[PDB]
Structure formats: C-alpha cells, structure tokens
Structure 1
Amino acid sequence: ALSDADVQKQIKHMMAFIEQEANEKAEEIDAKAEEEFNIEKGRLVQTQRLKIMEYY
C-alpha cells in the first residue's frame, strides 16, 4: 500500500537538506575565501609594506 508515495515523502524530507546544507557549506566556504582575501591582504603584504616602510 506504500507504493512509491512514501518513497517520495522520505525523499522530500531528505533531499532538501542533504543537498542544500552542502550548498550552504560551499557558500560559507566562499565567504571565508573572501574573509581570507582580507586576512592575507592585511597580514602578509601588510607586513611587507611595513618592512619596506622601515627600510625607507
């Protein structure tokens, strides 16, 4: 009596977070890639700029 309707109910329950939480993980990974743009640009080359400024 279950047929494929119960199957599709569990699939509606499952898909909508198994795929989308991984999508959100990708999005926050990209967001941290932007935050790490900022961190690298404000730490590594910032120290480089300070060193050359000391030289100057």
Structure 2
Amino acid sequence: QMVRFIRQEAEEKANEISVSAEEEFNIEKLQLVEAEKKKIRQEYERK
C-alpha cells in the first residue's frame, strides 16, 4: 500500500539520480569542449 508506493517513488528517485549522473558526465564532456574556442582564439591567432 503506502509502503510499496513510497518504495516505488524512491526507486523512481534513484533512477532519476542515475540519469542525472549520466547527464552530469555528458555535461562535463560537453562543457570541457565548450569555451575552448575563445581560449584558442586568444592563444593561437592572437599570438
């Protein structure tokens, strides 16, 4: 009843947290590539 529903909700929260883990890994992967263009611009052709 209520206990089983709470367990299902917490399992959904665990799934959401794991999805957030994967999303944060991909977010680091994208963000490291992001903002590199300006650094290369000031570092490579400015030099």
Please report the TM-score for the alignment, with normalisation by the length of structure 1: 0.62
Q: Superposed, which structure 2 residues align to 1:28-47 within 5 Å?
A: 28-44=19-35, 46-47=36-37
Unaligned 5+ residue runs, structure 2?
A: none
Please report the TM-score for the alignment, with normalisation by the length of structure 2: 0.70
Unaligned 5+ residue runs, structure 1?
A: 1-9
Name 1:55's counterpart in structure 2: 46
Identity over aligned residues, as a percent? 7
Task: Tell me the matched-pair count.
Answer: 44
Structure number with greater Rg is: 1
